[PDB]
Design brief:
This is part of a larger assembly, with 7 protein chains of 7 kinds. Chain C has 6 helices and 4 strands; from the N terminus they run αβαβαβαβαα. Chain C has helices spanning about 5-20, 30-40, 75-80, 95-100, 130-145, 150-155; strands at about 25-30, 60-65, 90-95, 120-125. Chain C has a 4-stranded parallel sheet. Chain D has a 5-stranded mixed sheet with strand order 1-2-5-4-3, with helices on one face. Chain D starts with 9 loop residues before the first helix and ends in a 26-residue tail after the last strand. The chains are: A mainly alpha, B alpha/beta, C alpha/beta, D alpha/beta, E mainly beta, F alpha+beta, G little secondary structure. The structure holds 1,2-diacyl-SN-glycero-3-phosphocholine (3 copies), 1,2-Distearoyl-sn-glycerophosphoethanolamine (2 copies), NADPH dihydro-nicotinamide-adenine-dinucleotide phosphate, iron/sulfur cluster (3 copies) and zinc ion. One iron/sulfur cluster binds next to α4 of chain F. The PDB classes it as membrane protein. Keywords: Complex I, Oxidoreductase, Proteoliposomes, Membrane-bound, membrane protein.
Chain lengths: ~120, ~350, ~160, ~210, ~100, ~180, ~50
């Protein structure tokens, strides 16, 4: 009635999580190629840790429709890296190498400015 | 009161950090990274220059509209120094050449000029003053580059008692003349080395580490009147440091020993060049001067800077010396244990 | 002689050659590129000033950024700039390349090409007339004429 | 007749009304509402499941022959449960007429892809996904078309800010173009322009 | 008129000038500060007061449609002169 | 009504076929295109001698901005901010306050000439002909910061181009 | 101008100046407004 919704690809978290793992392996196997094709200065260890970091931000989702969209955006991002539609600048934007470390504790945030 | 400019913003390009810095020698190698860091947080930077205005164009994109201001100055004109520093709150000195010209010698660029800048800075009310010396500065050293370094270092400390003095080791980076120097020796076949490089120990440091230390010395109020010593986290034999460089570049490494006098005779030959000499007798002495261990001076960890290993950042410096793209690795050179 | 005299005259010669044989590399991006074409048309004929119609990055001496620089295009512009042999000058043409112009506040536009490359002449207008761009090029030639590369070397 | 008022064409208002009922009687399973505007444009409001049946009928039926997809776009109205309105504009060269077909979806419900009906809907649906995030199922190649690679968010949504979240710059330390949080030397100035006095009584809503 | 501050910087017609210790003065080193020499408050003070013989006079700045919107100025008060709100021309009534 | 651009059938008589064979083997149409480029060689070129000759303009030309004055030297601008409201690129910034004599005048008047789309809407909106676009189009600069005009820069343009600006307005104000 | 001279006015430049870019006479932007917030000046004389 009110909770009846059309699905994207997956009908329950079991099928959804299946697609997540298929995506994780695809990204895991690709990092060595990306670090070598783009001549990146990072190591393969950092590349796979960054992939893990992106998968663990969304570990709290429980809506299969939302999980499907996260995977769909993941496959598009993967296709842009395998086919080299991206460039070395785009790949290195997951690491934020030019931004200073913004403080996370109350005192430091209090000294610099008014933002919480 | 007419200072403490009250920084505003989120520490970005269009923010205001409250630093008005006059960076002498901003058009070289170390200056290229200091202006970049100062301008990355919205700092007012005054850049005196002696070169052609065309040679300062790589600095303009480093700051927001109106933040980088260029002026003419002359090393022997105290008035031109007065104009550049009278509005600033920190003066950074990076002047220095690796060879002697027909109009400036090691005495002029490492003793007189740093003394003139320091004296004028004092008389203008500049609070902070950063001066760069060498780790191996000593008045009993064969290299005349390092003898005048020690004289100037002490001469600044008297004129500006509250000045901060930094003493880095050899610095490696994209525009360096340390790793890039151990790659163009291939032009002459083998790689000469005094005592085969087994009698020399080097402790290279990363350019960005030196840059982040300078910035943090400006903000830190405890760095006034305090001397420092920046060094990387590993010591190397000159042989295995040069061996590593040729391995990363995939070039054929052919070393052969050479007596000290012979190496200085070829050094004499290259100094004849009326342009930037490829090498000099002073370059041979410093490259073969074992880096001092100064355990009584604070290092980079006292400024909150984690030293970057030379293995991590050696590839980016030496990629352009390879003769292939996508070659396909090199193992680290042995690190001399501490103590 | 004095040495300075010889250096002064050599500076004039090399400056004369460089400002008399400018070969631009037009980055025709948006509407400002149509006016750049009209500066090559018969009425103005930039070829008569020594400015060839077009060239490739390896044989070009001046880049003319004429149009809106998007975030998707900025990396491409920088790589072309880095591959120009030196001396290399940049001319920023129009409000879009100067400071963002009509699309200054858009999410997808670089606010002035000077955030990506160093600029030498800023030509205003939306678009600048083909005469304004010609005035900009002639102003760059005077800037090259004032260069003192060899004098400063002699006093090093 | 008044020189300054648009003349009213009553004949074309009558014809499009008849065809609107005609279409509503032939596809009752999907059509939810049919209206004609005062400048003679007809709108058919359908259920999102009827995208393929309705468009196929209007393209193939002898009395419709709408063989050109003029435009396919979307509109974002956050006050609705289904915030996305997918609009199809069609043209019949045979009968020299135009019709507009509208449906609705939300962030998570995928609409069916009309590439099998009109091959022109290929890129238009890539533009909708890129700028609004509406997913079209069974699309041959669905990906961003107008935004920068790696762009996060869907710019044409009403809640996406005008200047965005990141801006590009060249950094000389890393020797490449980097992205950083956006800061503006001059904040965009917002103008409150609406007059507090009602202008068009004919469109007044119930209290 | 144009006047100089103790440090030597010219004061603009709006009253703007940088303090002695302000760091923003460094933008003028090797360059100049652009100030208009024709302060408008002084020039409009040099115009004679026009004598008219009616209670209400109208001003349009001169030039007809090249001027400013036409405004009618009341002149009953005899302790001051009616002033045009757009252009600043003053008017006075003839001894009454 | 319509016409056929390319609906033709070549004649197949031996006379016409031989004509096409002569064209194929003797390059007749190619040698007829050389004549058109030979004639242009002997026509006078259309190039003007810049900067000693200038392309024609008109009184309505939209060029560099300028703040104007009344003939008495008073500023025309009365800080109404209509130009700021209609500028489609938001390139005008204005602050105001009563002047020492009590008049309504501006303290800040900035035009960011790198945002401006040189459209003219500011001189249409102005009710006192204070902001105009003069005829200057030769004001390119070597720095971005020189194209951020403030009120002092704009009044200098008006005091510098008033002889010409006043004439152009005289020749076009009856069309407005 | 010889046949039809322009209207003369007292505030018009009597000496034309050309493009001054790249010279010590170049225009340099600045804020024409005065300071908005005034801070408190502490007393010059002690208390205890
Ligand atoms: C290739 C091989 C070349 C041969 C070897 C190199 C010798 C080349 C000699 C050619 C010199 C021609 C100089 C022409 C200068 C000219 O035409 O006027 C330009 C200008 C005048 O023209 P203008 O550029 O200022 O503008 C003209 C006016 N408009 C643009 C409005 C139409 O003269 C100069 O002020 C510059 C002088 C150039 C320097 C001349 C001295 C050269 C001495 C060389 C020393 C020996 C070197 C070894
Ligand atoms: C076929 C036709 C061939 C025509 C060739 C004719 C050449 C005419 C003579 C030109 C002589 C000058 C060419 C060198 C100019 C180099 C230059 O522009 O850069 C400035 C260079 C660089 O000066 P610098 O040392 O201050 O800058 C280097 C450091 N950076 C890059 C960071 C700024 O100056 C010189 O190297 C001086 C060159 C020698 C001057 C005396 C001439 C002797 C030349 C040999 C004979
Ligand atoms: C100073 C300049 C002085 C002029 C120097 C001669 C320039 C010649 C070029 C202009 C020719 C004029 C154009 C013209 O009449 O061509 C139209 C004519 C006709 O072109 P057509 O294509 O329209 O003819 C079609 C119509 N029918 C089928 C009837 C023929 O071209 C010719 O007739 C030229 C044919 C002779 C070419 C011979 C082959 C080349 C062999 C050269 C020797 C090797
Ligand atoms: C035959 C010609 C031989 C000369 C080759 C010179 C080396 C190549 C070169 O031009 O590099 C010069 C280099 C400075 O220029 P570079 O490092 O290439 O790039 C700078 C960009 N900012 O300068 C350098 O930093 C390195 C200079 C070379 C040092 C060689 C050391 C000589 C050792 C003795 C060799 C045997 C002597 C017999
Ligand atoms: C000589 C060609 C001209 C000629 O023979 O007279 C014209 C005559 C009329 O031809 P036609 O228009 O076709 O009329 C008959 C229609 N049933 O032509 C004819 O009736 C002949 C019909 C065509 C058959 C002969 C054509 C032979 C062409 C072969 C190529 C000859 C040239 C080869 C060498 C080329 C060297 C450049
Ligand atoms: N590079 C390294 O490995 C080390 C650096 N240092 C010292 O720190 C400082 C940083 O130098 P660095 O950037 O690394 O190397 P650079 O040689 O590239 O620095 C050159 C800078 O100093 C200027 N300069 C040289 N001579 C003069 C002079 N007579 N008058 C005016 N300016 C002059 C140059 O101006 P211009 O370009 O116009 O000629 C330029 O701005 C130096 O003192 C250096 O000795 C200490 C230990 C290691
Ligand atoms: S500045 Fe004007 S003419 Fe030039 S590209 Fe931008 S909008 Fe088009
Ligand atoms: S011409 Fe148009 S864009 Fe430029 S300042 Fe005037 S209103 Fe704004
Ligand atoms: S519209 Fe005219 S009078 Fe009003 S603020 Fe703008 S320039 Fe001044
Ligand atoms: Zn008036």
């Amino acid at each position: 009635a009110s909770t009846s919704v059309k699905p994207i690809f997956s009908r329950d978290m079991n099928e959804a999580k299946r697609r997540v793992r298929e995506l994780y392996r695809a990204w895991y196997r690709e990092v060595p190629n990306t670090v070598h094709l783009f001549q990146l200065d990072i190591s393969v260890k950092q590349g796979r840790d960054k992939v893990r970091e992106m998968f663990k931000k969304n570990a709290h989702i429980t809506d299969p429709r939302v999980v499907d969209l996260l995977v769909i955006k993941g496959k598009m991002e993967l296709e842009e890296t395998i086919k080299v539609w991206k460039q070395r600048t785009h790949v290195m934007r997951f690491f934020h190498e030019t931004e200073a470390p913004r403080p996370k504790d109350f005192l430091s945030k209090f000294y610099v400015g008014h933002d919480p | 009161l007419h200072h403490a400019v009250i920084p505003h913003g989120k520490g970005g390009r269009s923010s205001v950090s409250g630093i008005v810095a006059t960076v002498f020698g901003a058009t070289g190698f170390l200056g290229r990274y200091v202006v970049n860091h100062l301008g990355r947080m919205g700092s007012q930077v005054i850049v005196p220059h002696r070169c052609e205005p065309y040679d300062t164009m790589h600095l303009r994109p480093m700051g927001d509209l109106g933040q980088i201001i260029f002026m003419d100055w002359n090393g022997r004109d105290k008035d031109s120094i007065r104009r550049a520093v009278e509005h600033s709150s920190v003066v950074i000195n990076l002047v220095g050449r690796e060879w002697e010209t027909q109009n400036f010698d090691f005495e002029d660029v490492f003793v007189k000029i740093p003394q003139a800048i320091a004296q004028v800075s004092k008389e203008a009310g500049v609070e902070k003053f950063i001066h760069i010396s060498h780790l191996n500065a000593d008045i009993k050293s064969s290299s005349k580059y390092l003898r005048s370094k020690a004289v100037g270092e002490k001469e600044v400390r008297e004129t500006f008692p509250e000045a901060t003095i930094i003493k880095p080791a050899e610095i490696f980076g994209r525009e360096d003349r340390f790793l890039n120097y151990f790659a163009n020796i291939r032009w002459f076949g083998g790689v000469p080395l005094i005592s085969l490089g087994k009698k020399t120990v080097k402790q290279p440091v990363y350019i960005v580490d030196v840059t982040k230390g300078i910035i943090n010395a400006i903000k830190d109020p405890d760095a006034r009147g305090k001397t420092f010593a920046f060094v990387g986290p590993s010591r190397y034999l000159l042989f295995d440091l040069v061996q590593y460089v040729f391995a990363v570049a995939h070039r054929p490494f052919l070393p052969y020993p050479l007596p000290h006098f012979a190496y200085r005779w070829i050094g004499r030959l290259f100094e004849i060049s009326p342009f930037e000499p490829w090498t000099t007798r002073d370059k041979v002495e410093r490259i073969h001067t074992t880096d001092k261990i100064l355990p009584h001076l604070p290092g980079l960890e006292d400024l909150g800077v984690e030293a970057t290993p030379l293995e991590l950042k050696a590839i980016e410096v030496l990629r352009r010396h390879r003769t292939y793209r996508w070659l396909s690795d090199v193992q680290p050179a042995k690190t001399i244990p501490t103590s | 002689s004095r040495g300075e005299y010889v250096v002064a005259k050599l500076d004039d010669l090399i400056n004369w050659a460089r400002r008399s044989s400018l070969w631009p590399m037009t980055f025709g991006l948006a509407c400002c590129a149509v006016e750049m074409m009209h500066m090559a048309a018969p009425r103005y004929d930039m070829d008569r000033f020594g400015v060839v119609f077009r060239a490739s990055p390896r044989q070009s001496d001046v880049m003319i950024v004429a149009g809106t620089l998007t975030n998707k295009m900025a990396p491409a512009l920088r790589k072309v700039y880095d591959q120009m042999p030196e001396p290399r000058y940049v001319v920023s043409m129009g409000s879009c390349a100067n400071g963002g112009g009509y699309y200054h506040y858009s999410y997808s536009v670089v606010r002035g090409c000077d955030r990506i490359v160093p600029v030498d002449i800023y030509v205003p207008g939306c678009p600048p007339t083909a005469e304004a761009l010609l005035y900009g090029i002639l102003q760059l030639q005077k800037k090259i004429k004032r260069e003192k590369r060899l004098r400063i070397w002699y006093r090093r | 007749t008044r020189p300054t008022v648009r003349p009213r064409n009553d004949v074309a208002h009558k014809q499009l009304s008849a065809f609107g009922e005609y279409v509503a009687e032939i596809l009752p399973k999907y059509v939810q509402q049919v209206q004609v505007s005062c400048f003679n444009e007809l709108e058919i409001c359908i259920h999102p499941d009827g995208v393929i049946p309705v468009l196929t009928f209007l393209r193939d039926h002898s009395n419709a022959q709408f063989k050109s997809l003029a435009d396919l776009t979307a509109v974002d109205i956050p006050t609705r449960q289904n915030r996305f309105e997918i609009v199809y504009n069609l043209l019949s060269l045979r009968f020299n007429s135009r019709i507009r077909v509208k449906t609705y979806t939300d962030e998570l419900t995928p609409i069916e892809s009309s590439v099998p009906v009109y091959k022109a809907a290929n890129w238009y649906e890539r533009e909708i996904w890129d700028m609004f995030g509406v997913f079209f199922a069974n699309h041959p190649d669905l990906r961003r078309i107008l935004t920068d690679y790696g762009f996060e968010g869907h710019p044409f949504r009403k809640d996406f800010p005008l200047s965005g979240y990141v801006e590009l710059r060249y950094d000389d330390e890393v020797k490449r173009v980097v992205a950083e949080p956006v800061e503006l030397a001059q904040e965009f100035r917002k103008f409150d322009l609406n007059s507090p006095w009602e202008a068009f009584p004919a469109y007044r809503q119930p209290p | 008129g144009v006047r100089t501050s103790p440090t030597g910087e010219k004061v603009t017609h709006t009253g703007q000038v940088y303090d002695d210790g302000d760091y923003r003065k460094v933008r003028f080193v090797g360059r100049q500060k652009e100030v208009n020499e024709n302060f408008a408050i002084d020039l409009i003070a040099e115009q004679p007061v026009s004598q008219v013989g009616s209670r209400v006079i109208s001003c349009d700045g001169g030039g007809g449609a090249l001027g400013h919107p036409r405004v009618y100025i009341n002149l009953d008060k005899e302790t001051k002169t009616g002033t045009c709100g757009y252009c600043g021309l003053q008017f006075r009534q003839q001894h009454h | 009504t319509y016409k056929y651009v390319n609906l033709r059938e070549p004649s197949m008589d031996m006379k016409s076929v031989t004509d096409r064979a002569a064209q194929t083997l003797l390059w007749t149409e190619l040698i007829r295109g050389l004549g058109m480029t030979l004639s242009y060689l002997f026509r006078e070129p259309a190039t003007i001698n810049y900067p000693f000759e200038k392309g024609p303009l008109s009184p309505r030309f939209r060029g560099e901005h300028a703040l104007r004055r009344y003939p008495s030297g008073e500023e025309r601008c009365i800080a109404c901010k209509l130009c700021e409201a209609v500028c489609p690129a938001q390139a005008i910034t204005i602050e105001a306050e009563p002047r020492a004599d009590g008049s309504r005048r501006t303290t800040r008047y900035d035009i960011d000439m790198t945002k401006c789309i040189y459209c003219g809407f500011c001189q249409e909106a102005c009710p006192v002909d204070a902001i105009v676009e003069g005829p200057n189009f030769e004001f390119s600069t070597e720095t971005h910061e020189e194209l951020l005009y403030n009120k002092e820069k704009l009044l200098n343009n008006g005091d510098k181009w008033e002889a010409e600006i006043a004439a152009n307005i005289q020749a076009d104000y009856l069309y407005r | 101008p010889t046949v039809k001279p322009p209207t003369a006015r007292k505030f018009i430049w009597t000496n034309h100046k050309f493009n001054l870019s790249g010279t010590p006479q170049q225009y340099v932007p600045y804020s024409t407004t005065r300071k908005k917030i005034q801070e408190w000046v502490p007393p010059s004389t002690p208390y205890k």
